[model samples]
Target chain A: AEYQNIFSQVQVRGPADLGMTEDVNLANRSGVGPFSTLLGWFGNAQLGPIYLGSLGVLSLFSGLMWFFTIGIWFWYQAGWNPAVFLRDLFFFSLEPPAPEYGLSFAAPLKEGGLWLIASFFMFVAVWSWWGRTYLRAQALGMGKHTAWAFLSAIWLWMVLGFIRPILMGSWSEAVPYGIFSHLDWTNNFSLVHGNLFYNPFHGLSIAFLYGSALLFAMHGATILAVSRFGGERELEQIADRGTAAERAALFWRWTMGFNATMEGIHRWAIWMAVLVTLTGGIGILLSGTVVDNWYVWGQNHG
Target chain B: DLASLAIYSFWIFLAGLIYYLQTENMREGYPLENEDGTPAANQGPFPLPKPKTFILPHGRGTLTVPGPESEDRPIALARTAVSEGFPHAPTGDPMKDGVGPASWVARRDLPELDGHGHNKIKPMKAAAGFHVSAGKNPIGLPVRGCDLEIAGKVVDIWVDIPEQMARFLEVELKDGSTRLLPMQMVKVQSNRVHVNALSSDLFAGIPTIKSPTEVTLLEEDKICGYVAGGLMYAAPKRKSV
Candidate 1:
């Protein structure tokens, strides 16, 4: 009876942790035999579904926030640097000025904003599907709904971070340039060129994009945990069937735990592609080329 | 035809102009043998005497051991004979040997060695073939250059080792005479000698300390030899791990 109680707790925790309970019953239903109850500790539905589901939601929101603001931040700095801005406006008036404000922000946002919105909705939709399925699992005496709540919270945090950079870009030109120029927080100062306002340049954009990309993989793994729902949602299932190790193995395999050789190669290639593409995009902007040319060259031959 | 001629003349003028811009001394004339005298044929130095054939001792035998002749020795002697016999002779005058002013001396003229001339043998015999042993004991003269003849190819080379020492081994034209000279004897030098020998095993097991600029691997030995002016002293013949 004690082992049975423990198995029941595992079933409740596991499904609720991953937002999965619709069709999968992770509880042991075979009359709670003594041997089966004893095996419940190892099999108690508690691994990847609970952990990945939680982290995945966090990562998803983190990625979305980064994707929307990366370009805007770069453009914002470029706008602050009056010299580079004026020079660019004079020579390349048609192109974006690396800021998310009126000229720089508005131009590309029209094209890329739609993609970000679509991706955000897609994440929400996936979360919803996962949440509904998780509810069903709970009704079957399995997992709980805590995992979905956690993911939703992370999503909300990321969705809201876009306001700060947007506000900065909008006020860049209106704010007096020379009055607060020396202040660190007021203007961008990390640009490669000696131009003061353009200092931070597009460096932060790259950092955000890469960080978000890693978050995407984490999100995928979280979803994977919910997907692994089947057969007797019981703790005994793990030990009696020798499935505790198998479940652990599954998470690592999906995330490349033991055989990380190929996964490592893939990660390297992905990181390289991200770096090369981001740098190439900013490179074209710095070279004063059209954004269209950058999109083509960064993704294509270059 | 008129347009073609005009284009040709324009290209020629452009070429001349570009050449003028690139060249510092436009007035310098073509090099001549003599400035004022009749057109002279200034042939370079004459060739050395043809090297003679000598047997190479086999199975751990030295040149000093005077017993059964080695089958490998004749091949070794052949390179020296050819080099010496066909010493760079002046053009149109075959009598002049290319030794320049240098002449070969008899074995009797060799300076006496008081046990100090011989090198300490650190024998390392592996499939890689060849061993090098270094000693603080002063040899009579530092190695000037070395000539290795194997499988029909002959390689004459000089090596500059660490601790201010140079080594040279030249295969003499008078058959089996292989001379090892010190750096003090030779003047200016280059380390490497290109040889098309059957195998590089002859040069293996000779340890040469890694120089600052040289590549860490032995495969880059040629580059090391090129920059440093001499053969690697005490090169190990065995393949390193």
Candidate 2:
């Protein structure tokens, strides 16, 4: 009898490990396996491509966007000198230095700014359409792994892109939040070194990084919804014995809002994004900017 | 059950449609080469060389040096380098310094007259008569003479270690050998920068001498000075046969 009880416990926990739980299939008690299974299959299938593509393509595009913005910053600093070089080198330094020579984009804005605005709107529209499609795919019952993987990719991508700017602010000045008045660091070597063409590349890099991060979080939540059913008989037993209110309570506890089976994954995605943003932001404010200001003060005092 | 199936299926269908639209490019055609083996014009620009170069192979070409004792000739032969592909330089006549701009050769290749000239020097070797110029030398043992060989004139010298620790001098010798000579032994004697390190426990493994605290070699002016002095003594090689 003791041996039999141990065996039963193992069986109960095994399915949970694979994101299987009794409540997952409770909604389909009418024995509609074919329809539900098909839905699950479809949802799973949509995940891999959506997740991988978002990470890869979005990063590439954003990197290009950020490149351009940075180029403009570099154009602001044209003169060649050691202090200028050092100032640019330590981006977070908060001291005021000489103005960098700005690149020409002024006169054209009057004539063709409308076109640029229209183009940007179109790009955003297309991106939204793409996002809606991925969401729909998740609702259809895509596999757990496929959905999770995509969400993971987005989380990682965003953590890298937005955390830097949000935490450090885009500018390399010594004062925190000084990016508004200072030049943003463009990763473009050429733009910083006075190459006019590199400005655009900086803009694109930033865009892709931002987009991927946002999408990853949303997709992960959907994955949780799909996996909240039919794994262990005991969970089903508890799910069966409980009152509707009790079941709902259990569901929240297990799912953490979605359903128990998928709760773990949802928690992971949300936490990952939050952790990345918070840590990166604090690091930027404390070290990247604070040190710069001190160095500038040192220069004046010395 | 049927109701739940219908709802789930509807959501699944919606998702499939959305994903299909967002990632439609997966089905789009990729470019293929033509039967004639030329890329289609619409396939964008032809591939060009990448910007950087790393490890390269030996003997794609030769770099034969002019006779070392040919004082009548200018240093034009030494400047015959051209950029190729990655780190590409323009090809030029060995006599003329090329048109437009001149590119730099790899640091290791700068001293070579030809491919065979490389690895002619054992830089880490000890000298026969080494000297120490500073305090608390790390190597501890005294150096006498360094056994260093080179293919051509030494162009530059650098001090690789700290001064207060060791008295070793890193010499970019004339034959392209970067040798570590004792600091005390090297002097302005006969314009040759005379140096020697005795072959003993102090200099047993010349190639593996470590903890060299200080090293120096001929600067550009010093290099020129050494070359000018070497010119008087260098004899042209005679054909034995």
The best candidate by TM-score is: 2
lDDT for residue A191 in candidate 1, whole number 0-100: 31
**TM-score of model number 2:** 0.18
For model 2, the superposed segments whose C-alpha errors exceed 4 Å read A1-265, A281-302, B1-241
Q: Relative to the unseen true structure, what is the C-alpha lDDT of residue A111 in candidate 2, on a scale of 0 to 100?
A: 31
lDDT of 2 at A141: 42
Give per-model TM-scores: 0.16, 0.18
After TM-score superposition, the amount by which residue A197's alpha carbon in candidate 2 deviates from its true location, in angstroms, is 30
DockQ of each: 0.00, 0.00
lDDT of each: 0.29, 0.29
A71-160, model 2: which lDDT tens digit per residue? 333333424455664466435222221113112123243232322333333344334434544544554444344334444444433333
